[PDB]
Design a protein around this nucleic acid. Sequence first.
RNA 1: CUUUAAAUCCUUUAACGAGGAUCCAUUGGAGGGCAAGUCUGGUGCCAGCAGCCGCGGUAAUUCCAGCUCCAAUAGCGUAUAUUAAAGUUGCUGCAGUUAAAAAGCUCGUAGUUGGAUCU
Lengths: 129, 218, 30, 56, 141, 82, 180
Amino acid sequence: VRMNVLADALKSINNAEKRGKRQVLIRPCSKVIVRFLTVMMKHGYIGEFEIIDDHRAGKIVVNLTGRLNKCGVISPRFDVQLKDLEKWQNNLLPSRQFGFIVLTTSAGIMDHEEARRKHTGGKILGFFF
Amino acid sequence: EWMPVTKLGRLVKDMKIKSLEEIYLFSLPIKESEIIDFFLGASLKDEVLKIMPVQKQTRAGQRTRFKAFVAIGDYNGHVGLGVKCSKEVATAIRGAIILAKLSIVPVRRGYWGNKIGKPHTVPCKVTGRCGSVLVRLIPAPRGTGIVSAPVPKKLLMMAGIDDCYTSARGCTATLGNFAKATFDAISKTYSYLTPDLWKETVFTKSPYQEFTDHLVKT
Amino acid sequence: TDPFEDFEFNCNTKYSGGVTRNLMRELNGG
Amino acid sequence: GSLARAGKVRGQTPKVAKQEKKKKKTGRAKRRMQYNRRFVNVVPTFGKKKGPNANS
Amino acid sequence: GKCRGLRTARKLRSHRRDQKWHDKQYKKAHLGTALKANPFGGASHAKGIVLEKVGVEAKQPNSAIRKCVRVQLIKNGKKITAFVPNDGCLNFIEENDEVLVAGFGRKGHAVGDIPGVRFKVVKVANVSLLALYKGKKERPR
Amino acid sequence: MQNDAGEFVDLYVPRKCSASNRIIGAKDHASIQMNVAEVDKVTGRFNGQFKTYAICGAIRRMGESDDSILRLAKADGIVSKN
Amino acid sequence: PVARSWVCRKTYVTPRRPFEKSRLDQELKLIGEYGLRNKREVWRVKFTLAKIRKAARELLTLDEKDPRRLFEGNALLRRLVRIGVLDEGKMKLDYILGLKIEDFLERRLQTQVFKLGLAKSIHHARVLIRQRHIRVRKQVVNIPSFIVRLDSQKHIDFSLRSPYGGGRPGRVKRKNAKKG
RNA sequence: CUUUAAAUCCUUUAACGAGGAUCCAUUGGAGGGCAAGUCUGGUGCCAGCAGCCGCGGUAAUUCCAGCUCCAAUAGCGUAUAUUAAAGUUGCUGCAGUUAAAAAGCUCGUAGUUGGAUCU
């Protein structure tokens, strides 16, 4: 059955970006999906999106600027300290100049650079570059 | 001498096109190796990667031809790889060199960490594939050189990549597929959209429409 | 002695490796 | 499958005494000689890119 | 596919540890039966007493008689066949004398022409075969 | 493209597909650069201006070059509403 | 139990591919240019450079204000400029990755004796140092691999007992004088 | 002299001590893998070489030798165990249509995993 709705959301965005489509529909929505999307959009990868508020669980329509190479989830959500972050960056990211690892930490959901600035670890959700 | 057969060759011969980058910017096909000689034909150095005999069984025996894999490229920013099969080895090498010249692509170079000096490594992890051979290029810190097998090392050095880590999977023993895969990885360097290439493209005046009158009256 | 056609009529015999090595030595001697 | 011929070819090979040649340099001098032979002078080459021990 | 769960460490570890047995080299080195069947008993070399000289016909494409000796190892009394490497070297070995024997270089596998022989004679009468071959040392009189 | 000194280090800057906003390869020969002539507002003839649209070969192969060029022209005022 | 110390380490690395033509040519070029004895000297300098590069590469992954990065990087840079391998103008951690093997080979006492003119050739410099003719400041140095610091460059004299700089003829000169 | 319980070396001074500076560097190789001779003499599927492919049945680029050459060098070869190579044990990170491989099928307890939502 459907576990890890974030995996489905990220896979839908990835498959839609590969096909060149200019919008993608994500369902169901959740707080974690919206936080991950906001982290993407702050760095200018997806752009604006809308949350269709159906009265059981939301849907999202995400616009797709053609800047997203890959977006993925990391499952299971491994707990990542500050020391393991560089190893995770080497494993997941294409370069040291671009691409982010998203973690859920006690200060919220944010990229690896922000977690380094805030001096906190967390659990790795996914990545995008 | 060089009498161009194509419009692009004529424009190149008439000093119309300033650089090979103005060909690459418009994805124009190159159909005359004399263009490559006209632009990089002083820093290009070739290298015969391999000569292999292929045999086709016939009524009275095997017809044996020789396939030459030749890598070409100035050791700054450009590289190409050509394969040609012929009855005579020297003819095969000449044809392979021409094909290598025709296939020369630009190689985008980036930095591993900080951005002091001219680029030395690949801008990101790239991957090329050819018939079960997978070649992955990884940015490396300045001064580590090419960490690779000899066959991809030749192409990477001849493309200007100062230092790079590599990984390879598959039957790398077949030199043709290995060379094609690492060449594909090299040629994917300029097709990777990094955030420094996000700025909107400014369209310039295409070579055919810029010097259009130069061919109207010619 | 010419490596070029030595390779062209010895690559199936006992001397394939030697003539191949000589031909590659002629091509890129450094 | 007899064992009677066990040192046949070595036994019947005509012995040739080694020549009296000069001693070779050793250590840094030998490496300097190699460097001079290979990178400093191009005397024995004919432009054909042969080997160091080529007899043809 | 493969289980990827935060609490799958036992399953992953047990699956890997069970599957490692299907690896041939690991099973050889960890089962111990191949160590029991090894004439050297895990040793790199072994001394033996030569019982006879034999000539082992080579494999199908080649045609030669390889010189070997049956030797009975001192440590356990197991009989083996050891190839006497160089030419005219079988003339350096007598009956019932003592030899040192090493592996052939393929970890208990036959090497090349010689079928079923996985050892080579290194010494004879406390002098190496190379010292007798090059004339540096003579067999004790 | 810029080092820490601020200079530009790229060999060249590739053009991007006007529709998918992806880099167009140097050896992708199915890609096109189409110039649509700009027409004077009043007299309705060619005034020497044009709009340039670059489309990559993947879009053309897929068959979406028509929709892409039509959408780009509509967004540029060359094609009337609907 | 013994009062001895078993701490020791190897100072070179044998290359992975033993017969690479380009590697052999480069190593022979280094040996001939700097008058070294074997490939082990080249590999030793390679090993020291590799360890310095490894330390710098590790320190470049730390935060720019990490106190350990500051302390250790400053120490490494001060050491590198002390022996003159690194210019003091280029004293960032990223410039350590730009050093070559020849920068470290340049600081050898053999090379310095050749450069300061005390010897006519690099091999002459080696035999000079090995024959107790060269002193650094006030210390006779027999080791051609002696890496000369910047503060020690200005004091490389010809020894105060060497025939060439001190004033006592050797065995050969004395015997030839006794012949007549 | 110094060292040291005792000259038990290293260091220091002095005498003698190099032209073939005979005060004589070796260990493995030269078809490929892999650096470096289809040069000469011998043997002729023999003797032997060869980790692997292979060489040898009368020009043997591979055996036995001479010369020459190259690799490391006061060191080099060999046997065995082990690490990397091995993304051929795969957590990162492998495979399962046809190359080795998805249980005949379904149920089902432990095990593993588990949709949105509460500033």
